[PDB]
RNA sequence: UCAUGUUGCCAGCACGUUAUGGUGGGGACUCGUGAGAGACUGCCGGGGUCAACUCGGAGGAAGGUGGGGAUGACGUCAAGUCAUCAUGCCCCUUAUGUCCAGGGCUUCACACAUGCUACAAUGGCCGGUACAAAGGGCUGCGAUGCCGUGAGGUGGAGCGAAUCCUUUCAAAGCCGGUCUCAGUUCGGAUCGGGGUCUGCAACUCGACCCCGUGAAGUCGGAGUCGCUAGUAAUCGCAGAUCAGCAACGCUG
RNA sequence: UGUGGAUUAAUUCGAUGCAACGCGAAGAACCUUACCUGGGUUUGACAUGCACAGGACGCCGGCAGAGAUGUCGGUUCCCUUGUG
């Protein structure tokens, strides 16, 4: 399709920061591995509690992980059940002693890799797409700043043999415009049919950010 | 050219074949030299991967390795 | 930049040796596409053997070769209803001086002398007396756009 | 890139020249590099999400 | 003489490391050489974008790394202490020389 | 003038008139002649007869030339036949021996490109 | 004294400046050595040919980067900006007559996919 | 422009005395990059709706979006990717599973495409002159010295490195001599010996070295492509996948 | 060099003007292999869950064997009494 570069892929230097931190001399391929293991590690449980962000940043080597979160109490449950149970799980996985960071995000549904996963948990819901997209995407603006949207949706929509899309855009959302600050979030539900990408652009304003 | 290969397996096969002086046809995976001048007499069953062709050892035999004696390449190409 | 009107093009400085642009243009010219000092010196070498097989200024003489080989009409390759209908056109004293030294190149690279230091003084020579090749296509450039004067008034 | 050729090649050879890269994110054996050991397709689409600290866009 | 040769992928993340390295040593009490950037360093290394042949439009990806050299001259313990007990961005890797 | 074969022409430096013999290229024209005492850049014309005694006899002794260089190429060539070798059935195909294209390439080996119907 | 930055392509000359017979100290060369081309002879004294100081003025050039042409227009673009330097009347002289303006026309970036930049490979489209 | 002197440059200074900033010191200058300034028709004049816009001049390094990049709205062609990956569905579950041996994947009587080499004297051979930057480098650069025709062998300094290796970084170019417009000192094929290294092993199935090879091709037919300035074009260097290289490739 | 056509055990597969053919393939003597010939494993080379024996497995070696694989040589549990 349309040549479009990722926003987070093209404003990583300019507006939007790196998930992970560090430096590393004679030291990237391992890094790179763990950081792999480490968010697969993490990838299903915490997409059904509603997980946002993972980031890892590398402290004197100890250890750097903080897991952004959309709802408090399914990732730390009962004091020790769940939190420490995964952070010694991560302890045995990773040759590092874990501290394990659990932070909560401030608001209700409003990053565009949480519209996504929203859209697809409900488009997995049996739910009308549509209902599923305007619902979602009414959930999504949000972010209190909020200035443009753009929704995408691909694939076997509603189970059918034709790989259908839908676009929806809301506002202000330049792509092209450089002082964007566009985030990006793309999920793929797994359907009794087959599967589902949904994409989300959200425009937070025209702040250079510089 | 520091050294050539030894066939370690069909080393020890020819050696074990020519001391009780007994020709018998080797059924030979190795296929990375007849560089060794010993292996003259020994019908090396040349495994190119469809069966054990025989290939002969002679003494004008050196220089170039035991793979393709016996050829793998089966061509024709055209028409047949 | 066509389409839009007329193009800018590189100014051309003299030559450094003798201070001529025609000699600098025809360093230039003979330019084998990557090499300029060693190109500099064959034209120079050129100019110097023209100069004392003719005993005047290599630049002079240069200019005599060149009006001998200027041309003053051009034909283009203009399509007219599907006909290859031949329109001459004044030629503008830049785009003809291009063209006089463009062919004068074009017969020096082809003379059979022992370097092109030789054959490019041999093309000079035979440019400003009016004997060489460049002269002889300058007889015939003319000769046919005179030939088809009766498809020169369609003024393109 | 069959699960049991990632084993193979993830498994001890007795040569010392069958070792190859055999990308293990994915399976694709070739095009892998040293400084990240990892094939293209997975490289752009790591490299588009920001989680490497430091990879970003050259312009000059 | 201690050459702390720090190293960051931004420069504005060096030049804060850097600066705060300075100025570590002088409240401690050290003689420091002004920030002198070591060139750059640069790979570039090209991928063919494409789960399948699509040769047309590769892209090349880069990397800043970003040197500074302060040749801190007569250290003292409370500044080698200092050296490593704290280093808040963790992004930034120190070779001692 | 009288070598052991191949013609030395009028207007050929020595090394030049050496390039053309299959015994002795450019490489090793200077070699033999800087090893004799003969220039390189000497034409055929002004050579004397007891150099090229002197010549004949380095060239034979010391270095492989159109004999040599025959009874060395085309006897090994049909050795390495001989044994079976895959650089043998290069030779037999009209292919490089060295395993390299003959997919299309190697127009000197199997001959140059033609066309099939 | 005053020392002049003359940048090319990737040529950087300083030079330094001193009234005197004329002069041209190179890396270790005089200007008969550096410029055997006979060219790039005139096209440096340009500046000099411009504002009469060839011999009346000099040159103490150490260049690093580029090559004889390159560093011959960075040697000649350390000459103008000097004669800025020196007399502040020369600057409009040369600015006029065509100097003093630095050439970003340097070997553009390559294109990828490109056998040169602005050079597509040739090709026949079957 | 400010800052900035180390590993870097070295005018202003000394010490090298050969090995060059190389060294002590030197911020002065790039250089090195942190910040900033500086093209915004900034000023003026001219048409134009008194408007855009346009032209021209001037200040300006940049002039009329400075330049080079980085910008893919809506959608476009079931193009391509279930062999990057998951994936709905079907099939085997004891095989299409599965390890290994060997081979092929490099095979060729050809068609096409793309390149290097040429087809020369602008050049071939031989020798001398001076300039590149980016780099890349820990089991890698790996030098000096040497055996070596030359691979290659030692060998490890300085080297996680503006320091040391890549040469104190080239080639083309400059010069001198030859060659004398030719199957040529073109041009390299082509293969043979012997080795040389890596590699368990180089026949398919690496390359290189000493030698020799001297073909076609004497600048290309129909027809065709690219290129608006650092552009066409030429030459050289480096980097990646690389233990050995098919790379004349790709990225610069 | 790659693609098409043809052999082949494989000459792996797909991509087939734009948008295939100095391509995925920024690297095929083993490897890469996906193909074939042949020899081994078969809850399998790889795993997960239920057991059931269990204190062995598993390792360091020898041998045969193209090698897979198999033979045993020697070690033989660490928990803490439920058994893992």
Known sequence: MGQKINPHGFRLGITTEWKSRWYADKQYKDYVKEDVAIRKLLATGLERAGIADVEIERTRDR???????????????????????????????????????????????????????????????????????????????????????????????????????????????????????????????????????????????????? | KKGPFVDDHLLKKVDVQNEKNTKQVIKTWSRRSTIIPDFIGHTFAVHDGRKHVPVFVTEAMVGHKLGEFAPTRTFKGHIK | ???????????????????????????????????????????????????????????????????????????????????????????????????????????????????????????????????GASVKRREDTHKMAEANRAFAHYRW | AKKALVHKANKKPKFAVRAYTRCNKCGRPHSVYRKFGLCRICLREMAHAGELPGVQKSSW | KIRIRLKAYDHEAIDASARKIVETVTRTGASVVGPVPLPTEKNVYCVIRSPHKYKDSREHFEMRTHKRLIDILDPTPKTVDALMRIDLPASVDVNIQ | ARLVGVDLPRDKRMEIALTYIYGIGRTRSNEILAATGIDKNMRTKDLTDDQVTVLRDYIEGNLKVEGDLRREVQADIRRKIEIGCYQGLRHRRGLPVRGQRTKTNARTRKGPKRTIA | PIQTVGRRKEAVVRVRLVPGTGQFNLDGRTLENYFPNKVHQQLIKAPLVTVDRVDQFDIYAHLDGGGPSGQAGALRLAIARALILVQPEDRPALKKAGFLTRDPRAIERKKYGLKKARKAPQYSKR
């Open chain 1, 63 to 210: 250890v750097r992980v903080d897991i952004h979160t959309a709802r408090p109490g399914i990732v730390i449950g009962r004091r020790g059940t769940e939190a420490d149970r995964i952070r010694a799980d991560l302890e045995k996985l990773t040759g590092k002693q874990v501290q394990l960071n659990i932070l909560e995000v401030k608001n209700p549904e409003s990053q565009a890799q949480l519209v996504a996963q929203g859209v697809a948990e409900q488009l997995s819901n049996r739910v009308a797409f549509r209902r599923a997209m305007r619902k979602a995407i009414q959930s999504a603006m949000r972010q209190p700043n909020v200035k443009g949207i753009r929704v995408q949706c691909s694939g076997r929509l509603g189970g059918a043999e034709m790989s259908r899309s839908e676009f929806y855009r809301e506002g202000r959302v330049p792509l092209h415009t450089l002082r964007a600050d566009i985030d990006y979030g793309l999920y793929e539900a797994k359907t009794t049919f087959g599967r589902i990408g949904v994409k989300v652009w959200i425009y937070k304003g025209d702040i250079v950010g510089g």
């Open chain 3, 1 to 131: 930049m066509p389409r839009k009107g007329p193009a800018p093009k590189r100014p051309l400085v003299n030559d450094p040796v003798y201070g001529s642009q025609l000699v600098t243009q025809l360093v230039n010219k003979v330019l084998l596409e990557g090499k300029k000092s060693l190109a500099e010196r064959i034209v120079y070498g050129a100019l110097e053997q023209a100069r004392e097989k003719t005993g005047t200024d290599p630049v002079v003489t240069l200019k005599r070769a060149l009006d001998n080989v200027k041309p003053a009409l051009e034909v283009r390759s203009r399509r007219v209803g599907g006909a290859t209908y031949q329109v001459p056109v004044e030629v503008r004293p830049d785009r003809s001086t291009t063209l006089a030294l463009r062919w004068l190149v074009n017969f020096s690279r082809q003379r059979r002398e022992k370097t092109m230091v030789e054959r490019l003084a041999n093309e000079i020579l035979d440019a400003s007396n009016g004997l």
